[PDB]
Symmetry: C3
Subunit: 174 residues, 3 copies
């Protein structure tokens, strides 16, 4: 009989210990369930971040491409453009047209083509021209002396023609 | 009899099993504690990352605006600037002033305005001018022939005046 | 003997409950192992992301610097460049060379230097020049009248020289 109370005592002990284990298991289960939930949310956030960074890194590739493009175009303009402050002569590969005038050193040297001219006719003299030729004129009429005047006048008129033709070919006059 | 031999054996069995469960439960507690702690640190890191990515994406929005701005400015300059390498004629909506000279095909055509001129007086001859007019000069004096020289000289001088007037009006001479 | 069956009942209950806890522990172990595994993968992902944002933020500093660079260069070009659409006069600090021609208001005023000229010689007349000077020519030969004609011709020729010299110094003719 009292061998049996000793069995009753241990059964009660086991019962308390089993109940304690059950309670401990339940506490662990809930903690784990809570932890599992947080892992899912962490996974959701991290998957979001991974997708974001992929998008960010792709965007940065585009940004680098756009920067390279604009740096290249700026570089091209820098080497190709006519500057207002550069002192060394600048050359265009094209003709040039402007409004109303061309100036040198703040002073107009060339304006619009001047019209109203009738073009002179004849053969232009581009050859030797002696402007200091003195023409002898005697007390008496000498055909050769007046003929020298005639020759000299014709030379002058053909030189005028040469000058006029030069301006017309340039476009300074009509 | 064999009554209690069998119950004590099972009680000993239960005791060992309860203790085994207890030791296994405790091991789970340690592992779970470590895992819970790692979850806290991960959440801290992910929260940090979430803020970084928000900041980065805001920065990238600004970058795109700035890229838009500079690309637009470059585009406007591109269409508005005078190029040194384009072969087709370029036109300014303004007059132009340069230092010391204008050249065509690498050769100076126009320089600074030349001073020191006294303006000629008279009526410029813009009409017909025959540079090949020949002036007959005979063996003997003929009024009409010498008068033809006078007329031709007056014409020539008035044509010179017309040219000089053109140059002064352009600004090539003062 | 009335009492021992009651122990049989409780022992059976304990056996079932202990077995339930043992299995429950095993189930928790599996869940915990799964969670621990996911935590490791999460850590690898987060560690990757932590390094990524460091690289991205360094990149963004570089981007802002590059944006600063082009914005600065665009700004410099904008103030320095010759514009095709501005209406008010533009000035170059340099000489200018162009291809084939200069035009004003859509019409060519200056072309290439014209060659083939031999320089006229003499003393250029830059002084007073009266183009309306009339030369009297009488019925009979008069030296003073023809001498005045000679004087007028020399003046005309020397004025031509002055004009030609002006054109040559500009570079409009060789
Ligand atoms: Ca018993
Ligand atoms: Cl148990």
């Amino acid at each position: 009989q009292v061998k049996n109370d000793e069995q009753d005592v241990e059964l009660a002990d086991h019962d308390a210990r089993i109940a304690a284990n059950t309670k401990a298991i339940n506490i662990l289960e809930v903690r784990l369930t809570t932890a599992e939930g947080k892992i899912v949310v962490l996974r959701s956030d991290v998957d979001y971040l991974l997708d974001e960074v992929i998008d960010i890194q792709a965007h940065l590739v585009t940004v680098d491409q756009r920067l390279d493009g604009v740096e290249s175009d700026v570089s091209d303009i820098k080497s190709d453009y006519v500057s207002k402050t550069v002192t060394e002569s600048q050359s265009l590969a094209s003709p040039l047209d402007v409004k109303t005038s061309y100036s040198v050193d703040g002073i107009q040297v060339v304006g619009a083509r001047q019209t109203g001219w009738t073009a002179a006719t004849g053969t232009p003299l581009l050859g030797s021209f002696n402007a200091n030729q003195s023409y002898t004129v005697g007390t008496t009429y000498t055909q050769s002396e007046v003929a020298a005047l005639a020759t000299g006048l014709e030379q002058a008129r053909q030189r005028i023609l040469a000058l006029e033709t030069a301006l017309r070919l340039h476009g300074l006059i009509d």
